[PDB]
Write a protein that binds this DNA or RNA. Structure first.
Lengths: 186, 168, 197, 95
RNA sequence: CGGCGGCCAUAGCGGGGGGGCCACACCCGGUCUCAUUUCGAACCCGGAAGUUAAGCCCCCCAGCGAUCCCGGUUGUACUGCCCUCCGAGAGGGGGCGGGAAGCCGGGGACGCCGCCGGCCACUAUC
RNA sequence: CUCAGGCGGGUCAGGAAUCCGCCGUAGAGUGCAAGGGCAAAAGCCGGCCUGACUGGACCCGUAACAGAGGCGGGUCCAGC
RNA sequence: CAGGAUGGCCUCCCCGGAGGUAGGCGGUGGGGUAGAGCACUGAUUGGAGGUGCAGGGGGCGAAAGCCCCCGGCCUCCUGUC
C-alpha cells in the first residue's frame, strides 16, 4: 500500500503540539549475527571499531551445536551501540553504500526498523582486507518516546500507556528524515 | 478373558493415569462418531443409564455395533446421527492366572497379588447418556428397537429407559 | 499476580517501584530509627522515622525548602552543599529527637562515593551525631566547600556560548551565586547554631 | 522413621492457592512477639530455614522468651510440654 | 503536589479530562566525583531555559478481572447419629443434627487508612 | 539485573548462539529421586572472598503422644 | 519372630498440692476427604473451521514448482473425564 505520508504529518503535528514530546532515536546497534568467531578469530572486529569510532564488545557463547556456538564460553560475534551524533554519522555512510527502498513489512512491527543488507565496509583502505574482507551486517534502530527514561531508572518506574506511547507510524518517518529511504509498499 | 463380575460396578478406586500404570491397552471400540452431523435432525433420543457402574470395553463395542447394524441396514447412513458419548479411562486390575501347581500356585495369597492392565472400562454415573442419537419422528421407531437391544448388553439394568429428551 | 487468580501476591510498593525489601528487612533489625534519605534532581530529603506496624511515625522532617527560606541560602537545592547543610538542620533536630542514632535508608540506589546520601551523612557527623559507618565513601573538601562546582560554573553560562567563559550549559542563576561563589557557603556555614538563625 | 524426617503428610498441606502464594507481606517478618503472649504457630513454607515438623501444625503456646532473631515458645504437643524455637514468620498474634 | 507505611488487586485492564505540578518528569551540560568486558542510555557530578504531554496526583466511566452479598438451582449433592428398619450374608433408606461447588440472574466495588513537611498554604486546594 | 516460551523484523540451510522490539506471574532455574518454596530471589551477571572456621550450649527429628543409643539439622551466644 | 528387655498399660505404697476440662457453646487458630470442575500440573476420545508447517499423494509438472490442494504435524470457539 502506502505508508510514508500519514506518518510524516502525524510527527510534524505532534512536534508543533508539544515540542518536547517528539519521538527520538534511543540507539543504533550494528551487529553481525552469524559470527566471525566460534572456530576462527574475528579480525572483522578491527574493521567494525574504525567504522563506529567506538569500542566494540565480545559476545559469550551458549548452547552446543556444530556450526557456531559449538562450546560455551567462547566469543562468537561483535556489536557496538551508537547513540547521538555517533549513530547519525554511521547511518548516512552505511545506508548509502548498500541499498534502500525495503518494505515496511520487513521492518519491525513497533515503529522500529532493522536494515538487512550485507557487504561493503566504508573507510578505505580497510575493506580489502586481511584476514576477514568485507563481511555482512545488520543494523537495528530502536526508537522510543522521550518520557520512557523515567521507566529505565530505579525511581518512578512506569510503563506508559496510550496517552503518550510510541506508535508504529511515527518511528519510521523519524529515522527516514535522518538518512534513509523506505519504499511505499508495506 | 473373565466374565463381567467385577466389570459391572464401581468398587475400586479411580486410579487412571498412565504415569502410575505406565500404559494400558486401548479401546476395543475403534469408532465413536458415526453417521452425519447433529444439525440435520430435529429430535434427540437417548439411551439413559440410571445406575453407577464400570462398563468394559468389550461391552461398549457389542452394544454400539448391534444398534448400528440395524440402523445401517434399514435406514441407511444418508439419515441418522449416532454418538457414543463416553470414553473408557478406567484402568483395570487383575491378579495373573495360569492355574499352576508344584511350586506354582496362581494363586497367590501374596507374592504380588497386585494388578495388571487388561483393558479400559468406562464409568457411567447416574443420569449419564450411554448413547445419544439424533433422528426425525419418522426415524424414531428404528432407534427404539436398537435401544432395547443395547439395554440387555448393559452390565446391570436401566430404569430411566429409552428416553425422549425431547430435543424439541 | 496480573489478571485472574495466578502466581504471586500484588504489592503497593512493587507497583510504586520503590524500596528494596532485602535491604529494608536488614536495616530495621537493630531497633534504631531510620533516617530516610531519598534523592531527586533538585530536592534531597532526610526524615527521622520509626516503624510501627500500622503506619510509620515521623518525629522530625527537614527539607531543602526549609534551607532555602530563612537561612539566607540561595544555592541550588540539587547540589552537594545543599545536602551538607541539610545534615546540619537534621542535626539540630536530632538533638531534639534526643537520640543521635541515624542510619541510612537510600531506598533503591547503588553506593558509590560523591553522592548526596554521603554528603548529608557527612554534614550530620560534624553537626555532632555519632553513627555507624566506616569512612572510605565521604566526598572531598572541594565538593563540600562548593569549589568543584565553582570551577565548572564560571566556565559555562546560560543562553550564551563562547570558548572558555560563557560556553553553553548550567552554571547557576541566583542572586548570591551568579557564577557560583564559595564565599556564599562560608557565610552560611558560619550561621551554625541550634536556634535556627 | 521409615518415611519421616521432616516431610510426610505434606505436599498439599504446604500447598496454597496461587493468590496466597508469593512471598508474604514484609510486616510479618519484622513483627515482634512479646513474652507472656499467646501465639498460634502456623507453618509458613515460603521460608525454609526454620520451619516446623507438620505434626506441630495448629498448636498454640506461650512465648517463654527468645534466642536471637527467633523466639522460644513453650507449647504443649499432646500431653508433653516442649519448647520450640521459631522465627517471627511462623507466629501470629492470638486476637 | 512530596516523603515514610498499613490492609495488600474492593488500590488489575481499558479509555476520558485537568493540574490548584519551581519543588516531583520530561529536558539540557557532562569538565569534574562517578556507571558501561559497547553508548551519561544505566550510575553519578551539574542546571532548568523549555514541555504538563505522559509519569505522578486528583476526578470519573465497569465492558473485562478480582472482592463481597442477595435470590434461583438447593436445604438439592453430601454428611455425623440411630434402627430385629428393609435386602439372600454387600448395603441402603427414614428420622435427628448439619449442608458445598459449578452455573444463571440481580447488585455494592475503578480504594481506604496512618504519620510528617511543602510552591500555593496555614485549611485543602492537590 | 529478571525468566522459559511465543510473535514480528535482521543474520543462517531452517535453526542455534547472536540482535532489535512487543507479549509473557514463573511453565524457567536451583548438581542428582520426588515434592514444596522462590522474581528489587534461592533465578541471571560482575567483582571481591574462602565461615565447608574454633568452642560450648539450646531444640527437634531419630523414637508423635510415651520409654529409645548413636547419628543429623536448625537455632544461640563466646572467639577469630 | 512359638523368645527377652524397656515403655504404654495394671496394682499397692508414699510424697507435694488446687485445680482438672473427657462434656457443650462462642471467640481466636489449622485442613482438601465426600462433593464439585476446567483455572494449572495432566493424561487423552471425537468431528468441524484454519490451511500456520515437518511431508506420504496431484495439478498450470518444473510430481507437492512459485500456488492451492488431500494421511497428516499443531492452533482455535468446542468434545470424554
Amino acid at each position: 500500500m502506502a505508508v510514508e505520508i500519514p506518518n510524516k504529518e502525524q510527527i510534524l503535528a505532534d512536534w508543533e503540539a508539544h515540542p518536547m514530546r517528539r519521538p527520538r532515536i534511543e540507539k543504533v546497534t550494528i551487529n553481525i549475527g552469524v559470527g566471525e568467531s566460534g572456530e576462527r578469530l574475528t579480525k572483522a572486529e578491527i574493521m567494525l571499531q574504525q567504522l563506529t569510532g567506538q569500542k566494540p564488545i565480545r559476545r559469550k557463547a551458549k548452547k552446543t551445536n556444530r556450526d557456531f556456538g559449538i562450546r560455551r564460553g567462547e566469543p562468537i560475534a561483535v556489536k557496538v551501540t551508537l547513540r547521538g551524533p555517533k549513530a547519525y554519522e554511521l547511518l548516512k555512510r552505511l545506508l548509502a553504500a548498500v541499498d534502500n527502498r525495503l518494505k515496511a513489512s520487513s521492518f519491525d512491527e513497533h515503529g522500529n526498523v532493522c536494515f538487512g543488507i550485507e557487504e561493503h565496509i566504508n573507510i578505505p583502505g580497510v575493506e580489502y582486507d586481511p584476514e576477514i574482507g568485507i563481511f555482512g551486517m545488520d543494523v537495528c534502530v530502536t526508537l522510543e518516546r522521550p518520557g520512557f527514561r523515567v521507566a529505565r531508572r530505579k525511581r518512578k518506574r512506569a510503563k506508559i500507556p496510550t496517552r503518550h506511547k510510541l506508535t508504529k507510524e511515527e518511528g519510521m518517518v523519524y529515522m527516514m528524515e535522518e538518512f534513509g529511504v523506505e519504499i511505499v509498499e508495506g | 478373558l473373565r466374565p463381567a463380575k467385577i466389570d459391572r460396578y464401581v468398587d475400586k478406586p479411580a486410579y487412571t493415569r498412565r504415569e502410575y500404570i505406565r500404559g494400558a491397552p486401548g479401546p476395543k471400540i475403534t469408532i465413536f462418531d458415526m453417521g452425519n452431523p447433529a444439525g440435520d435432525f430435529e429430535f434427540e433420543v437417548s439411551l439413559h443409564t440410571a445406575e453407577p457402574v464400570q462398563i468394559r470395553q468389550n461391552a461398549l463395542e457389542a452394544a454400539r455395533q448391534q444398534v448400528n447394524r440395524y440402523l445401517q441396514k434399514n435406514v441407511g447412513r444418508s439419515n441418522y446421527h449416532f454418538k457414543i458419548r463416553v470414553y473408557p479411562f478406567q484402568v483395570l486390575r487383575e491378579n495373573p492366572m495360569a492355574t499352576g501347581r508344584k511350586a506354582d500356585r496362581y494363586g497367590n495369597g501374596m507374592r504380588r497379588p497386585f494388578g495388571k492392565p487388561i483393558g479400559l472400562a468406562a464409568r457411567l454415573k447416574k443420569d449419564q447418556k450411554i448413547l445419544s442419537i439424533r433422528v426425525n419422528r419418522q426415524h424414531l421407531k428404528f432407534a427404539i428397537e436398537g435401544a432395547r437391544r443395547a439395554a440387555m448388553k448393559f452390565p446391570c439394568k436401566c430404569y430411566y429407559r429409552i428416553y425422549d429428551k425431547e430435543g424439541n | 499476580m496480573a489478571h485472574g487468580p495466578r502466581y504471586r501476591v500484588p504489592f503497593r510498593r512493587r507497583r510504586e517501584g520503590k524500596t528494596n525489601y532485602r535491604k529494608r528487612l536488614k536495616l530495621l533489625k537493630s531497633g534504631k530509627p531510620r533516617l530516610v534519605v531519598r534523592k531527586s534532581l533538585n530536592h534531597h530529603i532526610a526524615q527521622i522515622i520509626v516503624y510501627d506496624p500500622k503506619g510509620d511515625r515521623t518525629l522530625v522532617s527537614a527539607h531543602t525548602r526549609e534551607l532555602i527560606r530563612d537561612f539566607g541560602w540561595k544555592g541550588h537545592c540539587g547540589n552537594t552543599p545543599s545536602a551538607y547543610l541539610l545534615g546540619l538542620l537534621i542535626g539540630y533536630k536530632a538533638k531534639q529527637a534526643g537520640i543521635e542514632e541515624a542510619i541510612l535508608d537510600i531506598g533503591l540506589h547503588p553506593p558509590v562515593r560523591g553522592s548526596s546520601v554521603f554528603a548529608v551523612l557527612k554534614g550530620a557527623v560534624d553537626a555532632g551525631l555519632n553513627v555507624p559507618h566506616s569512612p572510605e565513601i565521604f566526598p572531598d573538601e572541594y565538593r563540600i566547600r562548593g569549589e568543584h562546582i565553582a570551577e565548572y560554573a564560571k566556565m559555562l553560562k546560560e543562553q550564551d556560548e563562547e570558548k572558555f567563559r560563557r560556553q553553553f550549559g548550567g552554571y547557576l542563576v541566583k542572586g548570591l551565586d551568579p557564577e557560583k561563589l564559595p564565599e556564599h557557603f562560608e557565610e552560611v556555614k558560619a550561621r551554625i547554631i541550634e536556634k535556627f538563625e | 522413621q521409615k518415611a519421616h524426617s521432616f516431610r510426610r503428610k505434606t505436599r498439599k498441606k504446604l500447598s496454597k492457592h496461587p493468590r496466597r502464594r508469593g512471598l508474604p507481606p514484609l510486616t510479618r517478618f519484622l513483627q515482634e512477639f512479646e513474652v507472656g503472649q499467646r501465639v498460634h504457630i502456623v507453618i509458613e513454607p515460603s521460608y525454609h530455614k526454620g520451619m516446623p515438623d507438620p505434626r506441630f501444625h495448629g498448636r498454640t503456646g506461650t512465648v517463654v522468651g527468645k534466642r536471637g532473631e527467633a523466639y522460644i515458645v513453650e507449647i504443649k504437643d499432646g500431653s508433653k510440654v516442649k519448647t520450640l524455637f521459631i522465627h517471627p514468620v511462623h507466629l501470629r498474634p492470638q486476637k
